[PDB]
Enzyme design. Structure first.
Site, PDB file in Angstrom:
ATOM      1  N   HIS A 197       2.612  19.110  22.849  1.00 49.25           N
ATOM      2  CA  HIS A 197       1.219  19.501  22.481  1.00 49.25           C
ATOM      3  C   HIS A 197       0.337  18.266  22.271  1.00 49.25           C
TER       4      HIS A 197
HETATM    5  S1  FES Z   1       4.979  20.221  20.217  1.00 56.28           S
HETATM    6 FE1  FES Z   1       4.980  22.450  20.220  1.00 56.28          FE
HETATM    7  S2  FES Z   1       5.312  22.383  18.022  1.00 56.28           S
HETATM    8 FE2  FES Z   1       5.955  20.210  18.195  1.00 56.28          FE
END
Ligand code: FES
Ligand code: HEC
Ligand code: HEM
Ligand code: HEM
Lengths: 39, 244, 364, 85, 383, 72, 50, 416, 122, 132
Positions: free
Chosen positions: J99
């Site tokens: 992310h």
């Molecule tokens: S990157 Fe998806 S929660 Fe750590």
């Protein structure tokens, strides 16, 4: 029955029609037509 | 994500093999394989393609066999137990330039050049992406961006930094059929060859698809007619209700 | 003609080149045995002989194109057959093997006879007019001619009774072969060489004919669903058959379906003179909605009486026509139609249907 | 159950209704296929359009607003607002 | 009696195919069931021809799939079928649920049928997911990992059930092998569930677009709705060919063609498209236990639907407000599916939370409230 | 010369691509100015012209794409 | 009995035994096309056995 | 025997010394087939009015057939000549009789008859079958008209009908019994006086495969009928059509011979008692016919089974009928023809029908010779031509929920 | 499912109060006209969910004429849906013919059922 | 359940001599990464000074590291697995690349999607080399 034999008629008809149209639409691209240039 | 992270979306070039009824330009497959062996074999494996896969696609069986003998492969060790090697044959898979991922990472500043036998079906833009990647290097990286040492800027690569660095340059390869070897031509040829390598069934698949569409479309029209015909009695029903 | 058994044979030419052969068992009808035996016997006639089974005789007959039936009448049990002129030697022989050596197997009594007899009885009685006529015969001729014409479960009959009624009946003196369109000499030869030759001259232990004992002034009521029907019945001596045939045709008779007759002017009304060997019954019936029948029967009663002797005489020719129509091969009729006046005051009455609406005899 | 076999489908006592029909082989198949598939289909779409359009308009307006906001956030001008979230 | 009724086997085939007294007013939507059955065959058929070449070992799963594509004669065709046909299986199943939601096919006389429906749905999803894990691409492996990690949120048994699922301490060879076995199997359990579905359908028959009783006018099935089934089947196969032969990887994700590597997570994890909505719901709820419970509720609340639907009239075809509510629900479901594939970002977290809220509010508020309001409106208007 | 470079040169000179090339060049100038200050290394937000470059390249690709393979 | 609805427009223009012959033609063509497609599919699948 | 009198009217008589009773009748064609919807039933009303006249001791009755009408004065042999004069009078004063008539009472009588044919399930089923089969043409109309159209008829309508159809070229005096033909002809010639006119053009009719379902769930049975375009009186297959019909013959479940009747369908339907009764028929009009069966099914769950088995047995007509079945059918048709021609009333009606509608009547011996010429191959050729795979017309009255819609029964006509 | 007893309870709750009556009743007629069932010949009570013992009893206790008219209207609606066509405005069911014919019988059925339930829990 | 062959091999010992005095290395225990590292002197001190209270996560470096310099971290950067990037994030320690979330040198969920500080395995060190 005649279903088995008759299926051959249609299968062969469509198969030959497509295998004669395809190598005409694509004759400039297929291998068997290009191999001469690289031989 | 940011536009840089997702990577610039490759455009849609009108490849000779896009339409529903066009095959690969097998001339382009042969030229792309030439460019592959000349440039890409220094770094990229392309393991899942065997020399036998090239017979009737871009090389006559004699050429593929000869290319097989030009390489060495490990055979069953001799009855004395010593290692033995044999000249390559058609059944053998194309060998990568590195023995294992460790060697590849060591020889490329830690970057691992992925096997190209599925690189077209394993990327968003498919063939286009590869093309856009190989010719997407700008002579001057966009102002302000700082690349990690060893990385080169390519907008089409997610994150904007790719360890490859431009490889295709003008007249880098002398094509066997006298075709000019502009960098764009080489990029198109390599992308087409890699697309074939990721989709060897492409030509057969689309021919079978044409036959299937013909059969099923005729049969669907026949079914439409038969259903409307056998339902004419029902759609033509007329009622009366005449109580006292 | 006759053979040593005293079996009468009558033969006469026919218009439509069909040998409408028929056998008339004189007194094996519904009058003779206990109520309903003759019906079951008629249902047993053509099933299993000592020569050909049902499934063989019926198949052969249908191949030959002929038709065969057994109808029960209060006087006689009639076995009708109808076939092309070429077919006489077969059917006549079969008929012999029907009167003699009919099998009467229990599996036929339970599978083909009782079910069929019950179905026929239910179908016939569903008609209020026929139920009324049966009741009228019951109350006019208390026994004999008044026996129910069809088998009814109220009088259970076992196979042994039907078998013992076939025997002790069907005798030479008791059967009369009648044919239409068959040479009398050829028919006599075929009958003589058939099984009819083996029948006894007379029944040793049955066929004790009883007197008619006509009763009048009676009435009855039979509640029923659906259509209603009111009937009026005059018992008549055989010698009066002429008077009432003229009366019936004068007012309207079932044999002559025609408008313009006084009785045809009212819905559902009809008349008919049932004729038997030793007595007859003149029936004026009305049928339909109970309210309609209530007035219809009174109108019919008022019409039957008060019929002008001039119109009665005019109806003589129509009555002769009706008698000619009725005189089929099975039911030979010999009645001299005279215009003599026919009284009605001695009437029996029977009502069927909505008994709350239909009138009583006291209202005529 | 509420649906028997053909003899007794559970339909109430039905009476006085006469159903006429003509055989196939004696009727014009696809009698009005071409004209109907256009006019009647347009009529049906006209009747049923609003029920699909109002919900679609609402949902797609929400989606467009969210998408445009997300695109705006990840830009050199949306950096500050992205940080504030 | 005719041979098609005297023989018990042919008697069953007749009762279900040749003389099934279908209502005369059923649209083409009622054909979807047949397609689903057809797809169940195809999934099985092609499926049985993939296991003949698929090797379930973790070090061979992806190479075995590529062997199917490249080496087996028609292996590319069999794989593309088995995959795009699963995608189409779920397209037809979502259409069959949408039809049952629009027309009141879930209402009283068929509640039991509806229940099996839901179970089938649940079971199918498992199968599909499990089968996808067999490819052991990047997205395959990491989908398995994320699923098992979420199931690790059960209050007490969670820490112990996951090793029983993984068959180890992480998605590895035992996990892929058990997924292959259970994936070969569960389709036959689903065939049994489909037989139960058909039995519950035959007991009370099928509904109508008008909702009113069809008993007044019912048609046989052999000359009618079998030849309609053929139109629907051939349209299905024509679109299925447009996908299988042309652009067969459109529905899939490219990252699934990168062999699974636990040491590198791909940029984004998304299920195969048809599970995206529920995945979105799973992310809308912050708590892992809350997320899994909310997701399984998003699937199971179909069971509550026949009781929350207080409508006196079956179906939406004659209802103004309920049709708007239904289409709004359908478009919110598509919005949830869309948010499933999108990164958890500033607007999308709130949008997904609101979309999940409305998705459940549909069943537990909107359907009862709207149905009651429309009952009252119908009665008041007629008077 | 390869067709691709001449196609990019032709497209970037097109009126549609002109504003993007403009914005990109003054973005380059602005980022160089930002790099001129001695405190650049300390700035938390160090601007870059990635977005303008992407816009320009998208608007140029939308022009080159349909025409390029006619050149090969 | 009564007046039937007028089907004049719905009636076919073609011969009594001819239209059924054409129906036979297309139903048999559908059957044999389906047989050919099934043959192709079954052959393709069984070729995997080889 | 034929004699064309003055006025051109033809007296046709079939005298037989063995006849029990004599009959003579005037028939003037133009039954319901000559009417139209508004004035339907006028022929029956006119014939009833004429037949209601004073009979002078005879029995005057109306015929009221589909395509022809007439008044028949049955009477004993010696009175025949008088009856002759009677009908002649009744027809020479037909317009006067109609004018002086109060049609009220006759119209309630005709309405009662029309209700009767709409209550007797077989009559209703067959009338509906004829109406649907020939829908759009006058032949579809009831013979006796409908209750709605009868009440709307007036004297002027009957007068117009008589003037159009009661003409010498369109009328025949038929007779039978035991009498001298010349005496009857002379008696009628002196008394018959009818208007001149051309024979009215007989309206066209064409069979149309259709289905009509009057489902009344309150009835106790299912009265259905299924038929194909048969053979008209002109077609040389007439007797061949009758033979084909008789191949399947009649059947009554409760009859004693029900377990022994030859036809295969009878043995088939008794295994589960599929049907209560049925009868195959070949109704023949002037130029078109209806060949099929009528049936009454008691068990409402077995209508489909009966239709399936009956149509399969029809399929047998074009393939597997044996010489036994053909011979049986020939014999039964000959016997049925001879039975139909016994009563003098029936003979007179037959003479009138044939002479009016085909112009010539084949004697019974000629009919027997024509039937005996039929071989099994002729019957199978007829089955191929007219029964095999031909459109059917269907009708049903009550408890017909199990009567599957048209396509099922129609497809049963060609499955092997 | 909601009982006709409760539906009528709510409807009479609204109709008694003039403000709600004035606001809703025009909307009720507008909703019933936009519902589109009248264009197929159906009265409102034809749409009711027949597949319930209460409702089955209600139909089973209809008069003869109403039962046959309901049968014909349902058959006509099925045919219209089958042929994808609607009744012209002149042949459609007018608002005044939508007379709520079956409601009283359903209410009687529910009254019987409610009394039975109440007495079983006496 | 885990089958002896899978059940054993859980220890997965990895030698620690090769790593730089301050570096991040990845060990594949339990089919997952165990991003290990030996702390740099400046980094170890910087962490001691950093306040646990300041971080939203309730964790401290002293509890996180058993042996002082040599400490073990699981590979997933975020609470939902994120492949761990190297030397990026709020403190420049790791990037939750899945992310793009920020992971601190501590390994805690310093910024972005992850709920908690990176899960710590059994970092048991026997003399020169250690087993997860
Ligand atoms: S990157 Fe998806 S929660 Fe750590
Ligand atoms: C020398 C080393 C080469 C040569 C001659 C080529 N490539 Fe490329 N490659 C190379 C590196 C170091 C990398 C690392 C990628 C990274 O940093 O992420 C790659 C990678 C690729 C990729 C991956 C693209 C992606 O994942 O988005 C592709 C595709 C690829 N390489 C293809 C490719 C082609 C077609 C070449 C033609 C000659 C080629 N490479 C040459 C290193 C090298
Ligand atoms: C409704 C039932 C089924 C559904 C919905 C379904 C769906 C799927 C899907 C979506 C995949 C992913 C494949 C890919 O992405 O490449 C898959 C894989 C697979 N399925 Fe099925 N499947 C079903 C039944 C079966 C059955 C009965 C078998 C029997 C063998 C089977 C065998 C396989 C195999 C072997 C794979 C591995 C994929 C590969 O090797 O390419 N499936 N399934
Ligand atoms: C392989 C999957 C399935 C098969 C083969 C199947 C089979 C069928 C068939 C043959 C029909 C009749 C035709 C039709 O009504 O469309 C039907 C209807 C139905 N389907 Fe399914 N079904 C499947 C899955 C489901 C699921 C998952 C649901 C809901 C979650 C569902 C809900 C229904 C309902 C409620 C009906 C009755 C429709 C009505 O009567 O109006 N089905 N099904």
């Amino acid at each position: 029955a005649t279903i088995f034999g008759g299926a051959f008629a249609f299968q062969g008809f469509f198969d030959v029609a497509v295998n004669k149209w395809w190598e005409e639409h694509n004759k400039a691209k297929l291998w068997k037509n290009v191999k001469g240039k690289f031989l | 994500m940011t536009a840089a992270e997702h990577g610039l979306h490759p455009p849609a070039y009108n490849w000779p093999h896009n339409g529903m009824f066009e095959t690969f330009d097998h001339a382009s497959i042969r030229r792309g394989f030439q460019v592959y062996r000349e440039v890409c074999a220094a770094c990229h494996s392309l393991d899942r393609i065997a020399w036998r896969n090239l017979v009737g696609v871009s090389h006559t069986t004699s050429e593929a066999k000869a290319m097989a003998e030009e390489l060495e492969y490990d055979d069953e060790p001799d009855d004395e137990g010593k290692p033995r090697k044999r000249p390559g044959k058609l059944a053998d898979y194309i060998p990568g330039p590195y023995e294992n991922e460790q060697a590849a990472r060591a020889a490329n500043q830690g970057a691992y050049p992925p096997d190209l036998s599925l690189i077209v079906k394993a990327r968003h833009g498919g063939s286009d992406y590869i093309f856009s990647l190989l010719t997407g290097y700008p002579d001057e990286p966009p102002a302000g961006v700082v690349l990690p040492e060893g990385s080169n800027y390519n907008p089409y690569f997610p994150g904007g930094a790719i360890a490859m660095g431009r490889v295709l340059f003008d007249d880098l390869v002398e094509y066997e059929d006298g075709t000019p070897a502009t960098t764009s031509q080489m990029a198109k040829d390599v992308s087409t060859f890699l697309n074939w390598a990721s989709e060897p069934e492409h030509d057969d698949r689309k021919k079978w698809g044409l036959k299937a569409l013909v059969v099923l479309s005729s049969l669907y029209l026949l079914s439409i007619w038969v259903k409307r015909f056998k339902w004419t009695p029902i759609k033509n029903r007329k009622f009366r209700f005449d109580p006292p | 003609s006759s053979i040593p058994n005293s079996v009468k044979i009558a033969a006469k030419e026919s218009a439509t080149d069909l040998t409408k052969l028929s056998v008339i068992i004189n007194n094996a009808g519904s009058k003779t045995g206990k109520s309903g035996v003759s019906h079951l016997l008629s249902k047993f006639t053509f099933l299993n002989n000592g020569a050909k089974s049902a499934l063989r005789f019926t198949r052969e007959s249908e191949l030959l194109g002929g038709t065969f039936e057994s109808k029960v009448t209060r006087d006689a049990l009639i076995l009708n057959t109808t076939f092309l002129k070429q077919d006489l030697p077969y059917y006549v022989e079969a008929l012999g093997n029907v009167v003699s050596n009919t099998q009467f197997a229990p599996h036929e009594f339970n599978e083909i006879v009782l079910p069929t007899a019950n179905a026929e009885t239910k179908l016939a009685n569903a008609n209020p007019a026929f139920k009324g006529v049966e009741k009228l015969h019951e109350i006019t001729f208390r026994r004999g001619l008044g026996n129910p014409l069809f088998y009814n479960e109220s009088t259970p009959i076992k196979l042994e009774e039907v078998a013992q009624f076939s025997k002790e009946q069907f005798s030479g003196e008791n059967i009369s072969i009648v044919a239409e369109g068959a040479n009398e000499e050829d028919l006599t030869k075929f009958v003589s060489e058939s099984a009819f030759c083996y029948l006894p001259s007379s029944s040793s232990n049955g066929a004790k004919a009883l007197p008619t004992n006509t009763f009048t002034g009676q009435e009855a009521r039979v509640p029923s669903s659906g259509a209603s029907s009111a009937l009026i019945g005059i018992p008549v001596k055989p010698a009066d058959f002429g008077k009432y045939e003229v009366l019936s045709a004068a007012i309207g008779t079932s044999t002559l379906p025609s408008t313009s007759t006084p009785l045809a002017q009212i819905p559902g009304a009809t008349s008919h003179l049932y004729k038997y060997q030793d007595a007859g019954l003149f029936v004026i019936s009305v049928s339909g909605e109970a309210s309609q029948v209530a007035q219809g029967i009174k109108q019919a009663k008022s019409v039957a009486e008060s019929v002008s002797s001039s119109a009665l005489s005019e109806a003589v020719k129509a009555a002769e026509l009706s008698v000619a129509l009725q005189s089929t091969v099975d039911s030979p009729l010999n009645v001299k139609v005279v215009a003599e006046e026919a009284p009605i005051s001695k009437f029996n009455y029977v009502a069927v249907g909505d008994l709350d609406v239909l009138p009583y005899a006291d209202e005529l | 159950t509420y649906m028997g076999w053909w003899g007794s489908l559970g339909s109430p006592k039905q009476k006085y209704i006469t159903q006429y029909t003509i055989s196939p082989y004696a009727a014009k198949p696809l009698k009005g296929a071409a004209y109907n598939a256009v006019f009647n289909t347009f009529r049906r779409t006209k009747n049923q359009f609003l029920y699909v359009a109002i919900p679609f308009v609402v949902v797609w307006s929400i989606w467009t607003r969210a998408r445009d906001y997300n695109e705006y956030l990840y830009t050199k001008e949306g950096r500050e607002e992205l940080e504030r979230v | 009696m005719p041979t098609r009724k005297s023989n018990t086997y042919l008697s069953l085939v007749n009762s279900y195919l040749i003389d099934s007294p279908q209502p005369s007013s059923i649209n083409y939507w009622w054909n979807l069931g047949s397609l689903l059955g057809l797809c169940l065959v195809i999934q099985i058929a092609s499926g049985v021809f993939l296991a003949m070449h698929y090797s379930s070992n973790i070090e061979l799963a992806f190479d075995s799939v590529e062997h199917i594509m490249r080496d087996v004669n028609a292996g590319w065709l069999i794989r593309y079928i088995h995959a795009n046909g699963a995608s189409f299986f779920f397209i037809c199943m979502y259409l069959h649920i949408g039809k049952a939601l629009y027309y009141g096919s879930y209402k009283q006389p068929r509640v039991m049928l509806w229940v099996i429906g839901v179970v089938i749905f649940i079971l199918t999803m498992a199968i599909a997911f499990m089968g996808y894990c067999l490819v052991y691409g990047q997205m395959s492996h990491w989908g398995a990992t994320v699923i098992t990690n979420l199931l690790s949120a059960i209050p007490f048994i969670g820490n112990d059930i996951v090793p029983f699922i993984w068959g180890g301490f992480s998605v590895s060879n035992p996990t892929i092998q058990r997924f292959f076995a259970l994936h070969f199997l569960l389709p036959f359990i689903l065939a049994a569930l489909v037989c139960m579905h058909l039995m519950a359908l035959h007991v009370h028959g099928s509904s109508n677009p008008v909702g009113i009783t069809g008993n007044i006018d019912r048609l046989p099935m052999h000359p009618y709705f079998i030849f309609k089934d053929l139109i629907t089947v051939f349209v299905f196969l024509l679109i299925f060919s447009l996908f299988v032969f042309y652009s067969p990887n459109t529905l899939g994700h490219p990252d699934n063609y990168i062999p699974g590597n636990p040491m590198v997570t791909p940029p984004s994890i998304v299920p195969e498209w048809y599970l995206l909505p529920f995945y979105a719901i799973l992310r809308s709820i912050p708590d892992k236990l809350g997320g899994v419970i909310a997701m399984f509720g998003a699937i199971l609340i179909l069971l509550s639907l026949p009781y929350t639907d207080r409508s006196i009239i079956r179906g939406n075809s004659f209802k103004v407000l309920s049709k708007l509510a239904f289409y709004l629900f359908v478009f919110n479901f598509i919005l949830l599916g869309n948010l499933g594939q999108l990164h958890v970002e500033v607007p999308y977290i709130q949008l997904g939370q609101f979309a999940t809220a409305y998705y459940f509010a549909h069943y537990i508020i909107v359907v009862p409230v709207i149905s009651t309001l429309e009952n009252i409106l119908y009665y008041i208007g007629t008077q | 010369a390869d067709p691709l470079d001449t196609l990019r040169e032709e497209c970037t000179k097109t009126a549609a691509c002109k504003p993007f090339d403009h914005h990109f060049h003054e973005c380059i100038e602005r980022v160089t100015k930002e790099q001129e200050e001695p405190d650049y290394e300390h700035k938390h937000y160090k601007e870059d012209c990635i977005e303008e470059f992407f816009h320009l390249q998208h608007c140029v690709n939308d022009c080159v794409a349909p025409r390029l393979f006619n050149r090969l | 009995n009564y007046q039937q609805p007028d089907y004049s427009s719905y009636l076919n223009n073609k011969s009594g035994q001819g239209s059924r012959n054409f129906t036979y033609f297309m139903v048999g063509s559908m059957g044999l096309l389906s047989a050919a497609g099934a043959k192709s599919t079954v052959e393709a699948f069984l070729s995997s056995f080889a | 025997k034929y004699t064309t009198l003055s006025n051109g009217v033809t007296v046709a008589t079939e005298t037989n010394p063995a006849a029990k009773t004599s009959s003579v009748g005037l028939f003037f064609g133009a039954g319901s087939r000559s009417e139209h919807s508004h004035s339907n039933g006028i022929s029956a009303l006119t014939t009833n009015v004429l037949a209601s006249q004073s009979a002078k001791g005879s029995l005057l009755t109306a015929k009221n057939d589909r395509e022809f009408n007439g008044i028949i004065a049955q009477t004993t042999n010696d009175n025949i000549t008088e009856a002759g004069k009677l009908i002649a009078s009744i027809a020479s004063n037909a317009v006067d009789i109609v004018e002086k008539t109060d049609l009220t009472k006759h119209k309630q009588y005709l309405s009662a008859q029309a209700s009767a044919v709409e209550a007797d399930p077989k009559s209703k089923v067959l009338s509906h079958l004829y109406s649907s089969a020939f829908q759009g043409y006058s032949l579809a109309l009831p013979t006796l008209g409908t209750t709605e159209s009868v009440e709307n008829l007036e004297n002027q309508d009957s007068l117009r009908h008589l003037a159009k159809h009661l003409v010498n070229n369109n009328t025949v005096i038929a007779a039978s019994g035991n009498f001298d033909h010349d005496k009857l002809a002379d008696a009628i010639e002196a008394n018959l006086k009818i208007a001149e006119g051309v024979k009215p053009e007989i309206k066209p009719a064409s069979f149309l495969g259709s289905e009509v379902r009057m489902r009344d769930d309150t009835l106790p049975k299912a009265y259905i009928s299924i038929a194909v375009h048969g053979e008209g009186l002109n077609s040389p297959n007439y007797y061949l059509a009758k033979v084909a019909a008789a191949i399947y013959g009649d059947f009554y479940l409760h009859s004693t011979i029900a377990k022994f009747t030859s036809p295969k369908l009878a043995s088939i339907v008794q295994e589960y008692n599929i049907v209560e009764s049925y009868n195959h028929y070949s109704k023949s009009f002037s130029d078109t016919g209806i060949w099929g069966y009528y049936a009454e099914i008691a068990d409402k769950f077995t209508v489909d089974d009966f239709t399936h088995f009956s149509l399969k047995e029809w399929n047998r007509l074009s393939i597997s009928i044996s010489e036994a079945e053909v011979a049986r059918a020939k014999a039964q048709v000959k016997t049925a023809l001879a039975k139909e021609l016994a009563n003098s009333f029936a003979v007179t009606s037959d003479i009138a029908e044939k002479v009016l509608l085909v112009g010539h009547r084949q004697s019974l011996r000629e009919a027997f010779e024509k039937i005996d010429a039929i071989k099994v191959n002729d019957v199978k050729e007829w089955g191929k031509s007219k029964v095999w795979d031909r459109d059917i017309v269907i009708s049903g009255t009550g408890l017909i929920e199990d009567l599957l819609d048209y396509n099922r029964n129609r497809n049963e006509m060609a499955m092997m | 499912v909601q009982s006709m007893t409760s539906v009528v309870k709510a409807a009479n709750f609204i109709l008694a109060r003039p403000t709600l009556s004035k606001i809703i009743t025009p909307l009720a007629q507008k909703f019933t006209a936009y519902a589109g069932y009248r264009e197929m010949g159906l009265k409102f009570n034809d749409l009711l969910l027949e597949e319930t013992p209460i409702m089955q009893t209600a139909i089973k206790r209809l008069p003869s004429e109403l039962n046959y008219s309901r049968n014909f209207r349902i058959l006509t609606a099925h045919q219209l849906a089958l042929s994808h066509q609607l009744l012209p405005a002149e042949k459609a069911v007018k608002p005044e013919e939508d007379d709520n014919y079956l409601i009283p019988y359903i209410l009687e059925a529910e009254k019987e059922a409610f009394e039975k339930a109440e007495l079983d829990n006496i």
